[PDB]
Amino acid sequence: MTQPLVGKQILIVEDEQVFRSLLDSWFSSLGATTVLAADGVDALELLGGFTPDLMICDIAMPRMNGLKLLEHIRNRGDQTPVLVISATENMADIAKALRLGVEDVLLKPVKDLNRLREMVFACLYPS
């Protein structure tokens, strides 16, 4: 109850180490086991070998943007649930992420961490 995410595995793709560490701290304290990847190309390779319950990522990324990563795995029949957290203002990029089937696109940096909690739970346990 204090650990609602026990048994769920969350992949976090984030190039900024501080935001990587913060997300790790927050999901781990809720009981999830975390896998963190600093690089989107690394994450693409990783997903070939495992099946996380949720993947968190950004549209904006240095090597390969998130829309590229999303399309590579979706074109490949991979229906891993994805939650995007992004500071992007670009309406067409948000729309493209939604067309690729992400659960939501949330603003970065997070303002309502209790909302993020309810939204992550719903990604992992939808109706």
For every residue of 69-103, DSSP letters joined together read: HHHHHHTTT----EEEEE----HHHHHHHHHTT-S
Q: How far is CA 86 from CA 7, 22, 48, 108, in A?
A: 26, 15, 24, 5
Minimal CA–CA distance to 13: which of 55, 54, 46, 49? 55
Residue 105 exposure: Cα atoms within 13 Å on the Cβ side: 22
